[PDB]
């Protein structure tokens, strides 16, 4: 259960981790610098699991040694912001990066985060599911802020292993 979180800056990667691991959320953006690590045991879908999580920096300058982390991980979590079409469009790139490194020997979850921002939605659930089916990855929509589907994201990934 070695998980790498990928996707564009400000989509909610860190926020999803903090929500799941610590059940908190904060509004003010602290960008991740390089690749942070968190390891903890959780009771997750009826078994104990040791979660080893790599939280990558979305900012372009930090995207050089990510290959090692992708090779090191059994699960890739690729997140976008449902309010931000570019961030969605860039998920093809991220999934490709995983595939280039592991092909079919990896669990991939595509995540449409920030659903609580309902009015500002620029990507439909439909389009998200479409992309997930086309690229053969799992799909879920979450809200780190409101606490929607975050436990489910980790559940579905843990039951995928
Ligand atoms: N409304 C809303 N805001 C969110 C949600 N998730 C994250 N945010 C906000 O969006 C901003 C970015 O969140 P981060 O968790 O720091 O995003 P990130 O993907 O880790 O960004 P980098 O580390 O720079 O790559 C912050 O201001 C968060 O408070 C969400 O589910 N809903
Ligand atoms: Mg971050």
Unique residue bearing structure tokens 């926020």:
15
Of all protein residues, the one whose alpha carbon is nearest to atom 2 of ligand 1 is: 114
**Number of structural domains the chain divides into:** 1
Look at residues 9, 107, 100, 126 and name the one whose alpha carbon lies nearest to residue 56. Answer: 9
Range of the domain at 30: 1-161
79 φ, ψ to 5°?
-115, 140
C-alpha 38/C-alpha 24 separation (Å) is: 16
7 is in an annotated binding site: no
Residue 49 and residue 42 in contact, taking contact as beta carbons nearer than 8 Å = yes
Of all protein residues, the one whose alpha carbon is nearest to atom 28 of ligand 1 is: 27
C-alpha 88/C-alpha 132 separation (Å) is: 11
55 is in an annotated binding site: yes
C-alpha 116/C-alpha 81 separation (Å) is: 11
Q: Which pair of tokens denotes residue 119?
A: 């009015």
In angstroms, the Cα distances linking 39 to 19, 55, 102, 147, 154 are 15, 11, 23, 21, 14
Q: Experimental method used, please? A: X-ray
90 lines ligand 1 (CB under 6 A): no
19 lines ligand 1 (CB under 6 A): no
C-alpha 108/C-alpha 77 separation (Å) is: 6
Q: What is the DSSP letter of 23?
A: S
CATH code of residue 82: 3.40.50.300
> Relative to the alpha carbon of 13, which ligand is closest?
1
In angstroms, the Cα distances linking 156 to 72, 89, 139 are 20, 24, 10
3-class secondary structure, 47: coil
User: What string of DSSP letters covers 85-134?
Assistant: HHHHHTHHHHHHHHHHHHTTSSEEEEEEE-TT-GGG--S-HHHHHHHHHH
92 lines ligand 1 (CB under 6 A): no
14 lines ligand 1 (CB under 6 A): yes
- The data reach a resolution, in angstroms, of 1.8
């Amino acid at each position: 259960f070695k998980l790498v979180f990928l996707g564009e800056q400000s989509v909610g990667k860190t926020s999803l981790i903090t929500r799941f691991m610590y059940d908190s959320f904060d509004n003010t953006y602290q960008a991740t610098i390089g690749i942070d690590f968190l390891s903890k045991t959780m009771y997750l879908e009826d078994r104990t699991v040791r979660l080893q999580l790599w939280d990558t920096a979305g900012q372009e300058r930090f995207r050089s040694l990510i290959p090692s982390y992708i090779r090191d991980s059994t699960v890739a979590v690729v997140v976008y912001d449902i309010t931000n079409v570019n961030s969605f469009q860039q998920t093809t790139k991220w999934i490709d990066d995983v595939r280039t490194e592991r092909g079919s020997d990896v669990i991939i979850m595509l995540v449409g985060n920030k659903t609580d921002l309902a009015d500002k939605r620029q990507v439909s659930i439909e389009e998200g599911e479409r992309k997930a089916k086309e690229l053969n990855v799992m799909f879920i929509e979450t809200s780190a802020k409101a606490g929607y589907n975050v436990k489910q994201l980790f559940r579905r990934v843990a039951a995928a292993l």
